[PDB]
């Protein structure tokens, strides 16, 4: 069984094949800081490297930011670097930049050649048009994602984003939610299980914090073609460190089906 | 945060609190078959121990019952003994006594003293009365349970045989489902977790086969106080070692809180 309906191949590894992929971020303050953390993350074994770059200081450099993501790429190796500027308004760190200053950083950075998949929030909305097109020029995953920290939508609400991430042109759909009791985590894994149904895209969920651990473990039997794992830092609430979320994947996959 | 809204104490072990249960069964066509797969299960660590005589050939004697019975007593110390016998229309093997001699057995079983709960079909509806009190003047606990084998009911099915099994007296109400897809597994978790709001008693539910493993290792988050392992042999679909079920529980429980 495939976890997606079409799995797609990135740099020689499946998202949404029959084995689920495990994604480790980076978060560091600065290209050093960013180098030495990668270097940790990747001699642990993730599917996939997130590169959380609202955290880098000089990311009004274009030039440091360039040459740290190239940097990048010579750590990471064969393992893929998805890149990924997460607004404030969906828990990202505050920046000195504007909505249109991201997207020109977002192009230059896919342009490098540096980076393997993008992610653009959906909420930018109509904006979302020129970065599809443009990553889809410079042979760039689009991930089109939607973070709710203040608790969990219904379940149509979620189907209705994932929906709508598949109409923007995405590659990938991402949902987050925060958990305020077990029946959040089973709404979330209800629209994950729908949503497989009906999209024809992959998808990446996970519900945060502790009452979501269970997601980032078992998602994928619903669905989720990617879980969020600690490599070294944790980018966001209830991530698990890689090692754990392994021995359990180990587990589910031998006596699940 | 319990489980269970009321947790219960049994021979030293608490069912619906923090942690959860774990049960091993042994199945034993005859009494020198029973007695090896104990001391091999005992050997694990197990919360509890399930005698599934309704492997037992015979079972025709109360004599050899009650004298395996006190024997199995002997190698479990205080593990509590919780004695099954499978209707055939539910899973079970092919049993030479009725109804009647199954209760007079469970009775005769109980005043043994030997065993600490008893599982008895909701399917028997008026006939629970009969073995009601016959577990209640033992101070045996009863466990009522249905069976799903060919596919899993509606949400509202499940939820109705639970809060029954508590209306016909039940100290725990017992529910287990075939799915057939994801989907059906979401259906007991969220039945589940449904009644656990609804009842004052503990739950225990769980999809069988290989789509139901995620049921046996995170069922206790939606309120499923015990779940079925391997200590020795299988009694049922989907049950996995009970090692294996320890690793999961660990860092399941350390993460989701």
């Excluded at 074994?45 to 930011?65: G, H, N």
Aim: glycine residues 8%; hydrophobic residues 40%.
């Amino acid at each position: 069984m495939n976890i997606s309906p079409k799995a797609i191949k990135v740099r020689n590894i499946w998202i949404g094949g029959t084995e689920p992929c495990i994604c480790a971020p980076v978060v560091g303050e600065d290209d050093r800081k960013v180098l030495r953390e990668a270097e940790e993350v990747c001699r642990k074994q993730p599917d996939l490297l997130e590169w959380r770059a609202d955290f880098f200081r000089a990311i009004d450099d274009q030039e440091r930011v360039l040459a740290t993501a190239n940097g990048l790429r010579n750590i990471a190796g064969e393992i893929p670097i998805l890149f990924t500027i997460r607004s404030e308004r969906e828990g990202g760190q505050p920046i000195p930049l504007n909505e249109a200053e991201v997207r020109r950083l977002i192009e230059a950075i896919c342009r490098s050649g540096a980076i393997d998949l993008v992610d653009y929030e959906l909420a930018y909305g109509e904006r979302i048009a020129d970065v599809r097109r443009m990553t889809e020029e410079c042979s760039v995953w689009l991930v089109v994602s939607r973070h709710y920290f203040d608790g969990t939508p219904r379940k149509e609400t979620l189907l209705a984003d994932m929906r709508q991430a598949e109409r923007y042109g995405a590659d990938i759909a991402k949902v987050a939610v925060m958990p305020k009791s077990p029946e959040d985590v089973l709404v979330l894994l209800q629209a994950t299980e729908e949503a497989r149904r009906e999209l024809a895209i992959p998808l990446i969920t996970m519900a945060m914090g502790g009452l979501g651990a269970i997601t980032r473990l078992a998602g994928w039997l619903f669905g989720s073609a990617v879980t969020f794992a600690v490599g070294n830092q944790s980018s966001a609430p209830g991530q698990i460190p890689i090692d754990d979320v392994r021995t359990v994947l180990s587990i589910l996959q031998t006596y699940s089906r």
